[PDB]
């Protein structure tokens with residue numbers, strides 16, 4: 014449509030411990046969004062003070078996924094057609110300490126959009 | 137604009153007397169900032185030039201600033217925002233010999249008067 | 254605009270001679286700034302490059318900048334202002350081998366010339 | 371278009387520390403195409419004319435509303451001479467304009483507080499720039515305070531660098547930040 | 553006419569060290585009549601979130617072509633969001649213009665590299681500007697690199713000044729250089 | 735309108751210490767809406783090519799008349815290339831204009847001298863910003879000198895900070911002051 018945007022930009026998600034959480038981040042570009050595609054996911058965990066820690070990055074056609082120790086190896090982009098409008102991720106084997114607000118920031122200049130998912134984990 | 141009646145003067149007084157130092161001023165309608173007066177002193181006593189002695193801002197008098205003149209300097213007018221920022225300095229003594237200056241701001245208005253005692 | 258005739262040339266000379274390095278220039282009426290001349294040397298001998306040896310500034314010569322050339326650099330024309338910044342380098346040694354640059358400014362004009370010796 | 375807010379030349383004692391004007395602050399906020407340049411200098415008066423190495427640190431906070439108008443509540447505030455400098459003269463124009471917002475720190479860029487800690491020489495000419503006659507002054511951009519939308523804080527620190535009592539006559543300080551959009 | 557190139561607000565992890573994006577660089581190059589003001593700040597991420605005194609120094613080089621377009625080869629490069637800031641909003645416009653050259657360092661003035669080494673406070677608000685919590689940041693103008701025509705290098709130095717582990721959250725830094733002619 | 739006065743690129747040896755040109759001063763005074771930015775750098779020559787820790791301090795004074803024209807009497811003076819930089823090229827235009835006054839320090843703001851003492855790195859790229867390779871440079875605005883109306887003084891201080899002999903090749907320095915009104 015007319016500019017860069019995400020579908021359903023706010024959302025809760027409840028899963029039980031051990032299940033995986035599918036965090037959707039689907040977005041549309043406009044012709045004028047001629048910049049480099051520049052995705053990142055961030056986490057504000059509830060458990061501790063810190064806010065907006067990086068978990069995963071897509072930049073220059075490569076995925077950097079090392080950043081948040083606790084989530085090591087459990088976060089993955091879900092769509093191998095990422096450049097067409099799908100920043101969705103999976104968090105597998107949910108922990109109790111995964112409770113927090115997960116944020117998806119998508120940039121392709123002059124476009125910017127973001128979406129937050131408050132994720133909760135039960136027993 | 138903002139200006140003061142007789143911007144330069146000299147005043148002769150003997151020890152002990154109190155000295156009246158006029159600073160009557162006119163405002164203009166343009167002058168919509170806050171009223172902002174200070175008196176300073178250039179004593180012939182020291183090299184020191186332009187030390188604050190008494191202040192007026194936020195409709196409030198601050199006076200404690202110059203050691204030698206503590207408790208002996210005060211504003212004469214009961215309505216200072218009318219245009220009268222005159223002070224008198226009571227119980228004169230020879231160390232008070234110098235050039236007293238009255239700056240009066242009321243944005244964009246600005247003016248000042250020198251008096252030698 | 255300010256120009257120097259023959260901006261590049263090779264000059265060859267064995268020991269003990271007196272090298273004449275021409276740097277003659279034409280001004281134009283635009284050029285209203287002070288005449289500001291510099292000669293530099295980029296020696297083949299060592300590391301460093303672009304080293305001041307002599308200058309003309311505010312109608313006065315300053316000549317002792319390069320220790321190795323001390324005393325053996327002089328301006329030739331006793332009328333530089335007219336357009337002759339040429340210099341002499343007397344009693345040549347083999348250590349003098351290199352590129353001699355001539356920068357002439359007269360705001361807004363600027364021009365330079367190189368000479369391989 | 372550019373715009374400058376300032377105290378004017380020969381500033382009044384406009385810097386309060388515990389309800390007493392004690393610092394004479396010259397402050398100039400000049401907005402050009404995109405950045406705002408803070409050009410400021412300070413002179414202590416009364417008990418703050420001379421500061422010693424045991425002087426405790428302090429903040430002089432300017433609080434601005436959402437339209438770039440200086441509020442009454444900060445250490446430096448609307449009760450003293452403050453306003454726009456017209457190009458061409460040294461007057462202080464108090465009548466607010468919508469352009470005043472352009473001098474404020476861009477609230478999206480500075481959505482969390484930013485800081486610059488610079489050296490701040492004291493009585494530098496007189497003491498001939500002696501190394502142990504410098505303190506530090508830190509600008510804090512948009513630290514929240516009360517109901518202010520924008521804030522600028524001059525925070526004076528590390529007086530214990532001083533070798534002894536020093537006339538509190540600061541250098542001209544310069545900072546820079548991204549200005550707010552109209 | 554003036555012109556600003558920048559990363560935009562809330563910048564991505566756009567700064568690469570040893571092939572991994574680790575520094576979050578806010579960089580703003582504003583050209584007014586003649587000079588370019590570099591206004592920049594940095595936040596470390598991952599292994600670079602906290603730096604210790606034994607941290608080894610490093611350079612973040614921006615490489616630009618002869619028309620002022622950021623190249624893909626530097627530590628900060630065209631693979632991340634970078635472009636023009638329109639007066640009036642905080643967008644980043646990637647479509648290049650001939651005016652972009654005006655933000656480059658004048659190649660005749662800086663025909664050999666120039667440098668400015670500034671103090672660079674880390675986590676300054678939180679540590680209250682403690683003196684041993686500053687490192688140094690040196691801007692290098694036009695040091696040759698690869699086939700770039702213009703370069704800007706932020707080189708972070710002297711981490712051994714730090715009294716201990718410090719959050720790598722830099723102050724706002726400001727530098728200045730003469731801009732290139734159209 | 736804005737205006738820049740400068741020495742041009744590749745400056746001549748234009749700085750006098752003791753009746754002899756020894757410092758190569760690049761100086762650029764850019765006036766935008768309200769402030770003037772001083773952007774300057776210095777390179778020593780002859781006996782001043784290398785300076786040692788025992789080097790005694792010195793001032794390079796620029797003296798200007800009431801119309802912003804550089805006078806012949808300062809350490810940096812009208813006998814060397816100095817003038818206006820046109821937007822669009824690197825020439826130096828010597829023909830004076832009434833606009834030149836706009837580069838001068840506002841004589842009401844600076845009715846008594848003001849100063850900024852900044853760190854000044856020497857040979858910073860080569861020595862990799864080693865801490866003990868910085869001296870200080872202090873700008874003094876409007877210190878009276880002879881019959882000059884405006885003065886700018888670059889005063890180089892505290893050479894005893896140097897760990898040893900250092901190439902006198904300064905960083906790019908940046909200062910700021912309020913410009914004079916037309």
Ligand SMILES: CC(=O)N[C@H]1[C@H]([C@H](O)[C@H](O)CO)O[C@@](OC2[C@@H](O)[C@H](O)O[C@H](CO)[C@@H]2O)(C(=O)O)C[C@@H]1O
Pocket residue numbers: 387388426427428429430431445
């Ligand atoms: C010299 C002095 O008074 N220093 C104290 C300082 C100043 O009073 C204010 O900064 C003036 O603006 O206040 C100090 O702490 C604070 C604030 O941080 C806090 O918000 O409120 C307290 C009151 O409990 C006090 O204002 C400071 O700035 O460090 C303490 C200084 O010693």
Ligand SMILES: CC(=O)N[C@H]1[C@H]([C@H](O)[C@H](O)CO)O[C@@](OC2[C@@H](O)[C@H](O)O[C@H](CO)[C@@H]2O)(C(=O)O)C[C@@H]1O
Pocket residue numbers: 568569570608609610611612613627
């Ligand atoms: C923290 C770190 O990795 N420091 C090394 C540093 C960085 O990797 C780069 O600055 C990355 O931008 O590189 C250091 O030196 C260099 C280059 O200057 C040189 O051209 O080549 C060498 C290898 O031969 C290396 O890349 C540096 O800049 O200091 C070494 C740091 O330890």
Ligand SMILES: CC(=O)N[C@H]1[C@H]([C@H](O)[C@H](O)CO)O[C@@](OC2[C@@H](O)[C@H](O)O[C@H](CO)[C@@H]2O)(C(=O)O)C[C@@H]1O
Pocket residue numbers: 750751752790791792793794795809
């Ligand atoms: C390297 C050197 O010669 N330093 C001396 C310095 C310089 O010559 C000047 O600064 C050059 O402009 O002069 C010093 O003192 C001064 C002046 O400051 C003073 O006004 O007049 C005296 C003569 O009585 C002398 O010129 C200085 O400024 O520090 C002395 C330095 O040794």
